[PDB]
Write a new protein. Structure first.
Length: 295
């Protein structure tokens, strides 16, 4: 059974797709951000088309494996949040039917846009209700469910408060200083963090995601070294890959990467809004939190 997406998940999708497809220029990027924020799939060009493909696949309305829309997932998305939604039976019926009629002829950006575009023009507001595409609807859901990570909340402090609670402050302090204490709480902590960073999904590690956090610190040159390590790690548990990285010649680079990613986890739109990498600010922020934790 397919599981509906949380507002954390869809916000991850939206921000990641914008990161991947917004142009690096300035005059160009502003148009795209302004339009996409209003859910306007304009202007119609390769940038917008591939952004559309990326969102459609992150929301998982389009299946890359089966290479086809899976319309039943619409229904799923709705039932999971059918009261907080604001969506009606008729709206979801028609949206599901329209998506059921789509056979895009291929899976390129251009063809998927050409297929789905009239559906989006017609049912954009249904899509925004179902997939938490408004600040009000997402806020309603967050408020209904205390187990979801919030917008401005760090993945790491979230996972800490779920895994350690108010117990083992000493082990949590050592863990936040990158100690391999080997305790059960630290293992669950690293699993929680890897799941939320998408370093691991459905049990399989995601080497491209770690590599990308290495690129984000201007250490792309380490990508091969980051692959060897992860491809040679014999375990399958997050703590295994974590320890492989910490007990390596790229330990300190890994900490720089991890800390930047923590900072960017407390605000999914960090790169969209235009923030850049600043090792000093990153570590200053980390030092404030760690001095509080180890207080
Ligand atoms: C099928 C294609 C749909 C196009 C995608 C659409 O262009 C989405 C844009 C995202 C939006 C989602 C809106 C609200 C979600 C809640 C955001 C919040 O918690 O502040 C904003 C957050 O990333 C961007 C801007
Ligand atoms: N800023 C890095 C936070 C971090 C990295 N590894 C950790 C392990 C435990 C913990 O509580 C926190 C952490």
């Amino acid at each position: 059974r397919w599981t509906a997406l949380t507002p954390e998940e869809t916000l991850f999708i939206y921000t990641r797709c914008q990161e991947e497809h917004l142009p690096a220029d300035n005059n160009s990027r502003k148009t795209y951000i302004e339009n996409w924020h209003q859910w306007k799939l304009q202007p119609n060009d390769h940038v917008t088309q591939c952004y559309t493909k990326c969102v459609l696949e992150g929301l998982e309305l389009y299946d890359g494996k089966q290479k086809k829309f899976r319309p039943g997932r619409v229904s799923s998305q709705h039932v999971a949040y059918q009261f907080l939604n604001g969506a009606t039976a008729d709206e979801v019926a028609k949206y599901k039917g329209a998506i059921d009629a789509l056979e895009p002829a291929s899976d390129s950006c251009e063809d998927l846009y050409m297929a789905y575009f009239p559906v989006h023009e017609t049912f954009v507001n249904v899509t925004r209700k179902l997939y938490h595409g408004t600040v009000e609807g997402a806020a309603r859901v967050y408020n209904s469910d205390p187990n979801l990570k919030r917008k401005n909340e760090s993945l790491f402090t979230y996972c800490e408060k779920h895994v350690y609670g108010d117990q083992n402050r000493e082990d949590m302090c050592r863990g936040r200083r990158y100690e391999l204490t080997g305790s059960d709480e630290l293992r669950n902590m690293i699993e929680c963090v890897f799941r939320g960073l998408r370093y691991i999904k459905h049990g399989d590690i995601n080497i491209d995601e770690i590599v990308r956090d290495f690129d984000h610190i201007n250490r792309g040159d380490l990508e091969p070294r980051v692959r060897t390590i992860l491809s040679d790690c014999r375990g399958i548990q997050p703590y295994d890959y974590y320890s492989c990285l910490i007990n390596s010649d790229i330990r300190e680079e890994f900490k720089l990467a991890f800390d930047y990613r923590d900072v960017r986890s407390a605000d999914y739109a960090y790169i969209v809004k235009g923030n850049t990498y600043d090792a000093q600010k990153v570590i200053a922020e980390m030092n404030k939190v760690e001095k509080h934790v180890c207080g």
